[PDB]
Amino acid sequence: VKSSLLDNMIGVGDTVLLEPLNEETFIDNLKKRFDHNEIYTYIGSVVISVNPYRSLPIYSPEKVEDYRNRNFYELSPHIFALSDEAYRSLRDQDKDQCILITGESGAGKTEASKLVMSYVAAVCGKGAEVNQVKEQLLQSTPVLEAFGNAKTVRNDNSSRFGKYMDIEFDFKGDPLGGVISNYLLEKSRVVKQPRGERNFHVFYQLLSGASEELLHKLKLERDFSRYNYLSLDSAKVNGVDDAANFRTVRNAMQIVGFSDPEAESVLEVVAAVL
Amino acid sequence: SIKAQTKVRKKVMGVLDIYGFEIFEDNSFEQFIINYCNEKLQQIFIELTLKEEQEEYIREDIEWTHIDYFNNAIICDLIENNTNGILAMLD
Amino acid sequence: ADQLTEEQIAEFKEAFSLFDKDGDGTITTKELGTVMRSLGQNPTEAELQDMINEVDADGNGTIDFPEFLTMMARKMKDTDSEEEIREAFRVFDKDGNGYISAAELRHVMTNLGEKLTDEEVDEMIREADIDGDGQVNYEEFVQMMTAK
Amino acid sequence: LFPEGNPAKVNLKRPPTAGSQFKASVATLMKNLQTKNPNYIRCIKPNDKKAAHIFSESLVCHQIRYLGLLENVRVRRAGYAFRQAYEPCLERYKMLCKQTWPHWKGPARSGVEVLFNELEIPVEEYSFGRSKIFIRNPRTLFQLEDLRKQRLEDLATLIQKIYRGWKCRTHFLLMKGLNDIF
Numbered sequence: 001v002k003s004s005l006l007d008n009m010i011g012v013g014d015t016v017l018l019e020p021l022n023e024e025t026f027i028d029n030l031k032k033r034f035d036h037n038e039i040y041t042y043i044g045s046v047v048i049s050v051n052p053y054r055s056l057p058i059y060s061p062e063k064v065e066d067y068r069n070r071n072f073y074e075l076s077p078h079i080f081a082l083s084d085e086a087y088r089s090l091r092d093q094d095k096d097q098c099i100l101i102t103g104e105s106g107a108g109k110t111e112a113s114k115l116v117m118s119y120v121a122a123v124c125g126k127g128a129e130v131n132q133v134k135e136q137l138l139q140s141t142p143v144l145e146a147f148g149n150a151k152t153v154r155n156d157n158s159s160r161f162g163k164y165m166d167i168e169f170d171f172k173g174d175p176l177g178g179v180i181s182n183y184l185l186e187k188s189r190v191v192k193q194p195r196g197e198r199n200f201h202v203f204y205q206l207l208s209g210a211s212e213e214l215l216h217k218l219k220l221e222r223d224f225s226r227y228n229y230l231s232l233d234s235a236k237v238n239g240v241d242d243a244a245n246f247r248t249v250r251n252a253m254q255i256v257g258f259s260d261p262e263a264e265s266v267l268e269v270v271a272a273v274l
Numbered sequence: 275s276i277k278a279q280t281k282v283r284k285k286v287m288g289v290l291d292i293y294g295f296e297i298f299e300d301n302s303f304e305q306f307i308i309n310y311c312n313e314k315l316q317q318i319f320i321e322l323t324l325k326e327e328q329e330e331y332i333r334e335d336i337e338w339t340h341i342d343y344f345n346n347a348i349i350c351d352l353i354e355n356n357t358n359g360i361l362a363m364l365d
Numbered sequence: 366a367d368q369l370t371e372e373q374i375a376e377f378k379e380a381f382s383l384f385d386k387d388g389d390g391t392i393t394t395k396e397l398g399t400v401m402r403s404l405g406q407n408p409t410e411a412e413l414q415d416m417i418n419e420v421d422a423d424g425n426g427t428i429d430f431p432e433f434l435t436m437m438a439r440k441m442k443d444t445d446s447e448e449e450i451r452e453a454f455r456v457f458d459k460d461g462n463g464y465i466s467a468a469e470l471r472h473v474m475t476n477l478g479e480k481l482t483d484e485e486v487d488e489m490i491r492e493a494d495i496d497g498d499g500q501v502n503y504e505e506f507v508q509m510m511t512a513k
Numbered sequence: 514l515f516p517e518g519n520p521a522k523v524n525l526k527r528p529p530t531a532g533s534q535f536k537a538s539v540a541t542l543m544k545n546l547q548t549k550n551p552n553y554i555r556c557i558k559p560n561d562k563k564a565a566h567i568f569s570e571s572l573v574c575h576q577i578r579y580l581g582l583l584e585n586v587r588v589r590r591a592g593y594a595f596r597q598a599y600e601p602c603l604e605r606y607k608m609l610c611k612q613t614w615p616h617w618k619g620p621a622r623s624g625v626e627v628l629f630n631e632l633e634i635p636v637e638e639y640s641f642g643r644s645k646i647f648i649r650n651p652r653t654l655f656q657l658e659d660l661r662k663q664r665l666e667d668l669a670t671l672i673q674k675i676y677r678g679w680k681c682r683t684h685f686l687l688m689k690g691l692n693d694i695f
C-alpha cells in the first residue's frame with residue numbers, strides 16, 4: 001500500500017490550504033508531520049524537507065519507480081514527485097529545468113541534492129550512460145566537501161559555496177554528460193576564522209589523516225598552533241572528527257580520476273597556501 | 275571527465291546546492307555576501323516564477339493581477355548599485 | 366423479442382449437459398459463473414450471489430436449466446465493448462508508449478480489485494511472455510482476449 | 514593556475530576586490546538560472562545537536578521566519594494551486610463522467626466542461642481558460658484523485674473478471690476440443 005492524502009489524511013500535505021494560518025499553526029504542522037516521520041511537506045511546487053538525522057527507508061528503487069509519472073496530488077508529499085515533475089517538464093516540454101535547494105547549514109541540502117540527482121539518473125530510462133556520470137558527481141561530492149565546506153559555529157559541515165550539479169540530456173533523451181560548477185567560494189575563510197569557527201577542513205585532514213613522509217615532503221608540521229591561518233581554540237570537532245576522512249577524500253579523488261602525482265600536487269598546493 | 279563531447283543543441287536539468295540565510299550572532303562580510311545572494315535568489319524567484327505566473331494568468335484570459343508582492347529590486351538597489359550600493363562604496 | 370433463439374437455447378443445453386460432470390441435471394452455485402463466463406457475459410461475483418440468493422432463499426446449491434435460461438435472458442442485454450477495455454488498459458498504461466509494465470500489471474491484477482490468486486496472474490504473465498518480459502502489448506492482448 | 518603571469522599576456526588592470534568578484538559570480542549564477550525553470554527545496558533542521566527525535570520549536574520558527582514560508586503560503590493562495598492543459602486532463606480524468614468515458618467526448622474543452630458539471634463541482638472551484646484548464650484548490654484534486662482511485666478499483670475488478678471470463682472461455686474451448694469431435 002501507500003500513504004495517501006485521498007484516503008486517511010495525515011496532517012495536511014500541502015500547507016497552502018491550511019487554515020487558520022500563522023506561525024504557530026505552521027510550526028504545529030511541522031511538529032505533527034515530524035511526529036509521524038513524514039518529513040516532506042509541500043507548499044505546492046515547493047517542497048519542505050525536514051532533516052530526520054536518520055535513515056528513513058523511503059528512498060528505495062521501488063519508491064523510485066513507484067513515484068514515476070505521478071502528479072502532486074496522488075501520493076504522499078515526497079521529493080521524487082517534484083523531481084519527477086521537473087523531469088516531465090524537461091522531457092515533454094523540451095525546456096530546461098533546475099532545482100534550487102536552499103536552507104540552513106546542517107539541514108541536509110547536499111544529501112537532498114544527491115537524492116534528487118540519484119532519482120533523475122534513475123527515472124531517465126537510460127541507465128547505462130548516466131550511471132558513471134552520476135557516480136563521478138556523487139563520488140566528487142566529498143572532495144568538494146573537503147575543499148569547500150567548513151565548520152561554522154552552528155553547523156559542523158557548513159556549505160560555503162554554491163555547488164551546482166548538471167545532468168545534460170539530448171532532445172531525443174540521450175545523456176551527453178554533466179557539468180559541475182562552483183559559485184561564490186568564500187575566499188576569506190582561508191585567511192581568517194571568526195573566533196568560533198575553523199578553516200576549510202582539508203587543512204585539518206592534511207595535518208591529521210596524512211602519513212609522516214607526506215608531512216615531511218610537504219614541509220608541514222602537525223602542531224595546529226604553528227600556523228596563523230589555523231585556529232587552535234576551535235580546531236577539534238566531534239562527530240566529523242579530524243581523522244581518516246583524509247583517506248576517504250583521497251580515495252574519492254582516485255575514483256574521480258586524479259592520479260597520484262596529480263592529487264600529490266593538489267595536496268602540495270594546499271600545503272603551500274597553509 | 276564528463277563533458278558533452280560533440281556539442282549539439284542540448285537540454286539541461288540542474289541542481290543548485292546553495293545555502294540558506296546564514297544569520298549568525300556576529301555577522302561579517304561573508305554572511306553579508308551570503309544574505310545578498312539570497313536576495314538575488316529571491317529575485318530569481320520573484321522575477322521568473324511570479325512573472326511567468328502573471329504572463330500565464332493574464333495570457334490564458336483570467337482577470338487577476340494578484341494582490342501584492344514585496345519586490346527585492348529595492349534591496350538589490352541597496353547593495354549592487356554601481357553608485358549608491360554597499361559593495362560599490364566598499365570598492 | 367424472442368428473447369432467445371432456438372439454436373442458442375440448444376447451445377445452453379449443450380453447455381449445461383457438457384459441464385455437468387455430476388450427471389444429475391443440475392450444478393452447484395460456485396461453478397455457475399464458470400459457465401456464465403465461459404459463455405462470455407462477464408458478470409460480477411456480488412451480482413451473481415445476488416441472483417443466486419434471489420432464486421434460492423434457502424441455499425439448496427442446485428441450479429435449474431429454466432432458471433439458467435431466465436438468468437441468461439436477463440444477462441442478454443449486458444454487452445461489453447472492446448473499446449472500454451482498450452481505454453482501461455490505456456489508463457493503466459502510465460507511460461503512453463503502448464507497452465504496459467508486467468510487474469505493475471501484476472500489482473494491479475493482484476493488489477487491486479477482487480485480489481486474484483498467483484496461478485491466474487501466472488497464466489497472465491505466461492500469456493504475456495510473447496510480449497514480455499517486462500513489457501506487455503495490451504493492444505494485441507485485448508484482441509487475443511476478445512477474438513472469440 | 515595563473516595564465517595572467519605570462520609576460521606575453523600583459524594584463525594591466527587592477528585586481529577586482531570582492532564585490533566585483535562575488536557580485537560577478539552572482540551575476541554568473543543568474544546567467545545560469547534565468548534560462549531554466551526553478552523548482553524549490555526549502556530545507557529545515559530541527560536542532561544543532563544532530564538529534565533524530567528532538568524537534569526544537571524555536572530554531573525551526575527561526576527558520577520559518579527567515580526562509581519566507583508564510584509569505585510563500587500567502588502568495589500561493591493568490592488564485593490557484595493547479596493548472597494543466599485540456600487534453601491530458603480529459604484523457605486522465607474522463608473516467609469520472611459517464612458520458613466522456615470511455616469515448617470520447619468531443620469537443621475537448623466542452624467535454625471537460627461536462628466533466629466538471631458531472632461531479633457537481635462548484636463554479637468557484639474550477640475556472641475556464643483559453644488553452645488550459647485550471648483548478649484553484651488542492652482538496653479539489655484530493656477529491657478528484659479519490660474518486661479516480663475508487664473508479665480504478667471498479668475498473669480493476671472489471672478487468673479481473675473479464676480475464677476470468679477469457680480463462681473460463683479457454684477452458685471451455687479446451688473442454689470442447691478434448692471430447693473427440695468427429
Ligand SMILES: Nc1ncnc2c1ncn2[C@@H]1O[C@H](COP(=O)(O)OP(=O)(O)O)[C@@H](O)[C@H]1O
Binds near residue numbers: 051052111158
Ligand atoms: N534526508 C536525509 N536523511 C538522512 N540523513 C540526512 C538527510 N539529510 C541530511 N542528513 C544528515 O546530514 C548530514 C550532512 O548533511 P548535509 O546534506 O551536508 O547538510 P547541508 O547540505 O545543509 O550542509 C549527513 O551526515 C546526514 O547524516
Ligand SMILES: [Mg+2]
Binds near residue numbers: 157
Ligand atoms: Mg552541504
